[PDB]
Design a protein around this ligand. Structure first.
Ligand SMILES: C[C@@H]1Cc2c(ccc3n[nH]cc23)[C@@H](c2ccc(NC3CN(CCCF)C3)cn2)N1CC1(F)CC1
Ligand SMILES: C[C@@H]1Cc2c(ccc3n[nH]cc23)[C@@H](c2ccc(NC3CN(CCCF)C3)cn2)N1CC1(F)CC1
Lengths: 243, 233
C-alpha cells in the first residue's frame, strides 16, 4: 500500500524519515598518497556531487514530495540542495568541536578552510551552527524533521490547492517535532520555545547557503551550480533506477 | 526587561513602532525610482535606530553588540515592514502612502524584478495567514535579536548570548499567548508559530539577494561607524 503524507501519525512520520536517510559517504582520496597532493576544493566538489545523487532518492522518500509536479520538485531541490548538504554536515560535526566532519576520512578544522578564499567565513558559520545544535542536544529524530522542513520550505515562495498541500505537509512535520518534545518530557512552554529555537537556526542555514551560492557563482567554472535542467534530468532519471 | 507580562511585551512593542514615512514629494525612471528608494531607506534607518532602542532587552546589550545586530538585520527589518504595509495591496508594494509600486515598475532597475517578486509573494503569504499587527511586531523584534546572534565573537564570558536567547524565548511566549487569546487550539498554536518563523527564512534570503544587488552597484550599505554614531546619539 501507500501512505498519504497527511494520514501519517507522528511515529510513522519519524519512521519514514529515519528510513529515507541517505548513507554517510567517504571522501574519494588515496590514504597512501601524501595529504599535500589533495585539492581541498576538488575533494568537497567530488563529495557534494556524490551526496547529491543520494539526496535525489531521499527527497522522493520525504512524505508529500512525489505528490508535487516534477517542475515543483525541481524548484524545491534547486533552492534547498546546499541547505540540505549544510544541515547534514553540521549534524555530523556535532561531536567534533572546532572541526567539520565532511566524511569519516575528511575531518577539517578552521585553519584548513583558510586554504580556499572566501571559505573561512562559511566554515566559521557552519562551526557556530554545529556548536549551537550540540548545546541544544539536537536528536536524530529532530534532525530528519528539520531536514524535511528545509526541503519543503526553501522554495515554497516560488495553485492554491497545491500551495495549501505543502503548508499542510509542513504542519504534519511540526506536529511530529512537538510529539518528540512532549515524549522527551518538555512542558508545553518548553515545547514552543525549543521548536522556535530550532526554526530560528533554519534562518541561519539559509544565510550560509546564500553565502555558499555566492561563492559558487563567483567561481570561473560554468557548471559549478546545479542548473534547473540538471536537477530535472536527475529527478526524471530516478524513475529508471532499480528500487 | 524580562519582567514584562506577555500583554506588557506587546504593548511596549506596539508603542515603539516607527512612523509611516512619505517618499520625496517631487511617471518614474530607472534612476528616479532607485533615488527615491535610497532616500526613503536612509530616512527610515534613523527611525529604526530609535525603534531598536525601545525593543525590550536591546539597550541591555553593549553598544558594540547593538551595532552588530543592526548591521546584520537593517534590510530584513525594512523588508518585513514593507511586506506588512503591502498586505492589503495585492500585486503592489506600499513603500510609502505616496509610493505604491507594481511589478512592472520594478523592471525599470536591473536585478530589482526578482527582489520585487519575492517581496510580493511574502506579502500575499502574510495576507493568506491573516498576520496580526501584534504578531508582526514580535516577528520584527525576533529578526533584530536573531539575525546577528551567530555573528558575535564570544571567546570570554560574553552570558550576553544567553540573555539574547532568553529575550527570544520571551517573544516566543508572547507569540503563543496572542494565539491562545485569539482562540487557537494548542495544535493550531504550534503550527502557526512554525509557519511564521519559516517565513523569517525567506526574509533572510531576500535580504541577502538585496545586499548582493547593493554591492553590485562604496557607501551603499550602512557602515559600522554610521550605525554606532546613530545608536550613541
Ligand atoms: C562547505 C559547503 C558544504 C558542503 C560542501 C561539500 C560537501 C558537503 N557535504 N555536506 C556539506 C557539504 C561544500 C561544496 C563544495 C563544492 C560544491 N560544488 C559542487 C558542484 N556541484 C553542483 C553540480 C555540478 F554541476 C556541487 C558544493 N559544495 N560547501 C561549500 C560551499 F558552501 C559551496 C561553497
Ligand atoms: C526594495 C528593498 C526594500 C526597501 C528599499 C528601500 C526602502 C524601503 N522601505 N521599506 C523597505 C524598503 C530598497 C532599497 C533601495 C536602496 C537602498 N540603499 C541603501 C540604504 N542606504 C544605506 C547606506 C548608508 F547608510 C543605501 C536600500 N534599500 N530595497 C532594495 C534592496 F533589496 C536593497 C536592494
Amino acid at each position: 500500500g501507500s501512505h498519504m503524507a497527511l494520514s501519517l501519525t507522528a511515529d510513522q512520520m519519524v519512521s519514514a524519515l529515519l528510513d529515507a536517510e541517505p548513507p554517510i559517504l567517504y571522501s574519494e582520496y588515496d590514504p597512501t598518497r601524501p595529504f599535500s597532493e589533495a585539492s581541498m576544493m576538488g575533494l568537497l566538489t567530488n563529495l557534494a556531487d556524490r551526496e547529491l545523487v543520494h539526496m535525489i532518492n531521499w527527497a522522493k522518500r520525504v512524505p508529500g514530495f512525489v505528490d508535487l509536479t516534477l517542475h515543483d520538485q525541481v524548484h524545491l531541490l534547486e533552492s534547498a540542495w546546499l541547505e540540505i548538504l549544510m544541515i547534514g554536515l553540521v549534524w555530523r560535526s556535532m561531536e567534533h568541536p572546532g572541526k567539520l566532519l565532511f566524511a569519516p576520512n575528511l575531518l577539517l578544522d578552521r585553519n584548513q578552510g583558510k586554504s580556499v578564499e572566501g571559505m573561512v567565513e562559511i566554515f566559521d558559520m557552519l562551526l557556530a551552527t554545529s556548536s549551537r545544535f550540540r548545546m541544544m542536544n539536537l536528536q536524530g529524530e529532530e534532525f530528519v524533521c528539520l531536514k524535511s522542513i528545509i526541503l519543503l520550505n526553501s522554495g515554497v515562495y516560488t495553485s492554491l490547492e497545491e500551495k495549501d498541500h505543502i503548508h499542510r505537509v509542513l504542519d504534519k512535520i511540526t506536529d511530529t517535532l512537538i510529539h518528540l518534545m512532549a515524549k522527551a518530557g518538555l512542558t508545553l512552554q518548553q515545547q514552543h520555545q525549543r521548536l522556535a529555537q530550532l526554526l530560528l537556526i533554519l534562518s541561519h542555514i539559509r544565510h550560509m547557503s546564500n553565502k555558499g551560492m555566492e561563492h559558487l557563482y563567483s567561481m570561473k567554472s560554468k557548471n559549478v551550480v546545479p542548473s534547473y535542467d540538471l536537477l530535472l534530468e536527475m529527478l526524471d532519471a530516478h524513475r529508471l533506477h532499480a528500487p
